[PDB]
Amino acid sequence: DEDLRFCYDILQAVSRSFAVVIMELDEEMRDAVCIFYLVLRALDTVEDDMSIPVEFKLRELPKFHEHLHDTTWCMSGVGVGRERELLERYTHVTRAYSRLGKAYQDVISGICERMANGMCDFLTRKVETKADYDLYCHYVAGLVGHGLTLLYVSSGLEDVRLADDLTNANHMGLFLQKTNIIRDFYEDICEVPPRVFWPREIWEKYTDDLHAFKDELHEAKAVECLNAMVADALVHVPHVVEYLASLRDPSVFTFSAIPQVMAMATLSLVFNNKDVFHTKVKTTRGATARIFHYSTELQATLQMLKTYTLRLAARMNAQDACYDRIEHLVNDAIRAMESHQ
Amino acid sequence: DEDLRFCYDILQAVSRSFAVVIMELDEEMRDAVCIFYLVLRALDTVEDDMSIPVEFKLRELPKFHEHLHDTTWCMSGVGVGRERELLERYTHVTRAYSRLGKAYQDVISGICERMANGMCDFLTRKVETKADYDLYCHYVAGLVGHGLTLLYVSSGLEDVRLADDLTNANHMGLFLQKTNIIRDFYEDICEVPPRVFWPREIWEKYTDDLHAFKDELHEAKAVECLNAMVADALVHVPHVVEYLASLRDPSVFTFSAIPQVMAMATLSLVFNNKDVFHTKVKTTRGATARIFHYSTELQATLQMLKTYTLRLAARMNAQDACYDRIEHLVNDAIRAMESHQ
Amino acid sequence: DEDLRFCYDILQAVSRSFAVVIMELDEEMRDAVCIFYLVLRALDTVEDDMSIPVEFKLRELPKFHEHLHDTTWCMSGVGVGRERELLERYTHVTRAYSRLGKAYQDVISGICERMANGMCDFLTRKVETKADYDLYCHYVAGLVGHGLTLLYVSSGLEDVRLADDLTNANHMGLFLQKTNIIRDFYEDICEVPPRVFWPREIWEKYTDDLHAFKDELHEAKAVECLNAMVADALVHVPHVVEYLASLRDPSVFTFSAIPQVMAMATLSLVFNNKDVFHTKVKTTRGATARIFHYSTELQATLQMLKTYTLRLAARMNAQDACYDRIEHLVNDAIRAMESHQ
Amino acid sequence: DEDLRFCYDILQAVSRSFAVVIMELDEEMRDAVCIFYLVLRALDTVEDDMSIPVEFKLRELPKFHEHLHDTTWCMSGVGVGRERELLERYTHVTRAYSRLGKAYQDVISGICERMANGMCDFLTRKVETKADYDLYCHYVAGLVGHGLTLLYVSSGLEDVRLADDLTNANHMGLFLQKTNIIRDFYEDICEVPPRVFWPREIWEKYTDDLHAFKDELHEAKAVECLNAMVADALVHVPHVVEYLASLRDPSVFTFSAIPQVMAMATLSLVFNNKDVFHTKVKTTRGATARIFHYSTELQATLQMLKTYTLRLAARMNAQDACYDRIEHLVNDAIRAMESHQ
Ligand SMILES: CCCCCCCCCC[n+]1ccn(CC(O)(P(=O)([O-])O)P(=O)(O)O)c1
């Protein structure tokens, strides 16, 4: 009882974004997700701490899920902020964990290990090909989609048919992750050491050095590359609509819908906007408020995604090289929407 | 002599279009240009012949230019009509070739090779992206722009400054080649096997299978795609003007300008035209007759381009898709033309 | 018996490098390769003589091969010492040449003429763009690759399959030529007039004057450029591996492999080395002695290239400016190798 | 036909041993066996790969046989070189499969799944007892014996009674596998991590640390263990004879007899041979050619197996600590051979 109280607080203190969205879910269901996020957010803390030697991570991370069956475990001064607190007093998480139906214990435990090894694979190398790019997103987000999806089926709140093919689920995750990777470009490169996720298979066509876009002189090629990334992201939209339209439970829907609409809105702002190369673009608090409101039932949300896909395509001219590819990606997306409208 | 006289006889037989504009040329330039054409024409035959195995082409095409240095070489059973004769009696071409100035020879030999190798590149891969489309047009037409431009400087008829930047020279070719690719859609997609040049990046918004455009049922989409192709072509117009505006010699100008005015005329007739998918759209012999008549100096050729670009723009409503796309490209062309009137 | 015997005598004294490797081929094929070299070396003698006006070379070279069928042709007052003897008594060369199979002759003559006009092209212009750098290397090296390959097929020692795509054969030559061009920087620049083969497109990013690299003051940037040159060279390794992997005959293999491993070993020494800007970096005699011994079969030569490539990568830190560009180029190389291990 | 081509090409690059023996087979049957191998070879890749997490294999391998009907499935980061190229381009394999006979398909899918699950079992534990040894060989070899046998009956080539008892079919597979495990002892133990297959129940009687065999100090006790392994494989011989005798179709027999005579030949060499603890014992490439030539019909192959089984015993004395055990296991095989003469 006392433990769950720590989780929801440490949560609300770790991700103000997620914390609000999760409130759309039902209590029992919500709890599982809450712990699930914390389990991953804990793993993400060890991976991110750059003051920790690599071989260490490659050694611990893999078997981080094993500490889920040990209510005595915890980690010392690893990470900073509230994150460092989650590890030092991780005990509370493992507690609430053992009080979850064995059904949820498996999903969380499995997804954890899988994501654990995934991160380790990329601690050795960087993102080169489109394949790499997609694999990374799968490891840090795709699997989350897989996880959440399984929990929906495990709770009976969602038809068992939903777990049959977890492809669209992966798309749900990849979309959000890619949207961020694109949006947080500048920040990623301003850190020391500089983090780069944009696959060379793409940015190389527009430059020899990715730090060149940091300059206002290479803007032309920069923005162009930006649209190249945006396009790559739109490929998932059609599948996002499919996954959303296949949800029956209104509680689960809103929880899965909002994050997607937020991304589309953000993706429409970053698309063909040089501002992405020096500042962090964000959607007005009013827009995100509107999004939260109407994203309660399939129809309203679909017409919202409709607007943002048209708002995105409206931000381009007839003299942009990506003109044709973008329009096609937009049409397909809309197609999928009308398909369910 | 007897060889050179054959070149002209075969030229007038194979090409009833080019052979007419080449007479605007002069006697060494015309001979060189005549030989240069026959060389590329012989190359195109072997490459476009589908009965010929691919591996062969990839082994013989890259060295096709070497034959220019061997007056005994020829080809027996290849191509239809006069084309077969051109290869069977290629001796004459090489015979005459050897009597040209090393300057002219180097241009022809060099360009022939570069083109041959470029062709070999697209023999084992489809034209997927817009970039692919531009590269192809560069290999088979853009390079002809370079060649001729180099022949001008070589002959001393044009200022050496011209060959400094061959970018616009490439635009001259791409404009012609694309216009033909757009105009000869039906003829190409009907051959066996069907020849496609329209880049997927563009036609995939309107259709899954390109053959669908032959069916009147998909006329609506066919026309939209068609207009997307035209917009893609209008991009080169401004540069076409710049190149023609940079020519000083009368002969060279007319020879370079006529084909361009012819293209802009054909383009203004195929644009938003639904007949391009079931017949070959041509200009009246009167329209072209006039073109050959007035395209002898900048000023006249300019107000003709202006006229045709206007006719082209006056063939669309505010209601339909590419309105904005086109009107923008039309203004750029005109604006570029006025900048010289 | 006197003519062919003269060929080797001159060969051994003009090329102390090639003259060694060539002894790996069987007599018949070896004699052909011997003439092929002497012809190219003679062609190289004219182009290299700087005490001879340009318009002279531009007239003679293009029609050099024609002298192959003339048992009395020769040239005097060209080349230093021995090289001069070659041209002075070029009679023997053509005599022994007039006894080589019609197959070989057509190859030597073919490549000769192609290379000749290629040199003439770069006698009036400089190596400005990367395309120029690649084309130049193709004219002086790439062609040697094509040529040698054709001789292998002609001799019947290699399957005719080998000459179906000389793209990698070109990569072979470029890798050697590029390596030497990089290693022999100081040597070439100190000559009067200063010889520069490093493309502006690459070094213009690090300096205004290329002579600045001779001064210890600009040492830093000089090294960065050196690494970019090496990076530009590593692009061919994966292809070099493919070519050697497609060889079946022992003699042909060693003869083709040895020079390659030598280049790689040399490249691993010059990479990120400042000494390159003031002396000739050589590999130990024992190092080459080893290469000659083990480079007799694929697998053996592969692990060497493997060791040398890793040593090259081990000669740097993540701090280095090109680290990433190289890191991925290194993996790309090792991958092709493992692909055959 | 475009996919089946990819198969044979990849097979020759992977199995240079099997690749030849499979050509013996007849057209129709030939294709089936080709796929069947590439299916098990693809599966074998995921297993052999050590860098892959253990939980990945257990979640994937068991469901591998299902990807056969999914004509667009493939894998990327798996296996080194050519084997990696198979999983990545596994498309052709799944297509060439979808075209095979319904009967042929069911069998390949069956053996695959079964074998896959057996591998997952031995992926989480070592080989301790002889039973473990035999069961392991059953999964990676004995099952193939069943597979092929079920393919001979399916094709109709062989009697339908040939599939009632697959015991001998298992012995066929084990004999080959055990002959390799014993022969490749060194090559396996010299990898990181060290691969050990010899059952503890057999080597413990001669050593405490199996690695000791790599040192000449324990050579004497290494040879005894080796001879214990041979006596362990001779058991299957009498059974291998019955199976080969049950065959009737020429093509099927040759394809089944060659590998067996090869194993026995290899066994006669590695028996009581101490060179097994530092190198790879191969059969003279001349002897293997003989085996290939004469193993086309039962009679010839019986006298060869005869010779090799006598060559095995013609290497020991009555003093050896195994004499008795071997001597009789030989006569047990020798008689079983003459029982068909
Ligand atoms: C700076 C000048 C740019 C040079 C670009 C010229 C190359 C354009 C391709 C020439 N072309 C393509 C098709 N045609 C028409 C013909 O194929 P052609 O035999 O060339 O007259 P046909 O008369 O319809 O048989 C002409």
Numbering used by the authors:
A (entry chain C), B (entry chain A), C (entry chain B), D (entry chain D): 28 to 368
Paper excerpt:
We next investigated the crystallographic structures of four representative lipophilic bisphosphonates (BPH-1218; BPH-1237; BPH-1325 and BPH-1344) bound to TcSQS and/or HsSQS. These compounds contain C10 or C15 side-chains, with or without 1-OH groups on the bisphosphonate head-group (BPH-1218, C10, H; BPH-1237, C10, OH; BPH-1325, C15, OH; BPH-1344, C15, H). In both structures the S2 farnesyl-binding site is occupied by the n-alkyl side-chains, and the methyl terminus of each inhibitor reaches the same position, as do the terminal methyl groups in FSPP (as seen also with the quinuclidine inhibitors). With TcSQS, the electron density with the shorter chain inhibitor is well defined and it is clear that the imidazolium and bisphosphonate groups occupy S2, Figure 5A. The results showed that in all cases ∼8 carbons at the chain terminus bound to S2 and were closely superposed on the more distal parts of the FSPP binding sites while the imidazolium rings bound close to the cationic binding sites identified earlier in CrtM. All TcSQS crystals investigated belong to the space group P212121 and contain four molecules in the asymmetric unit.
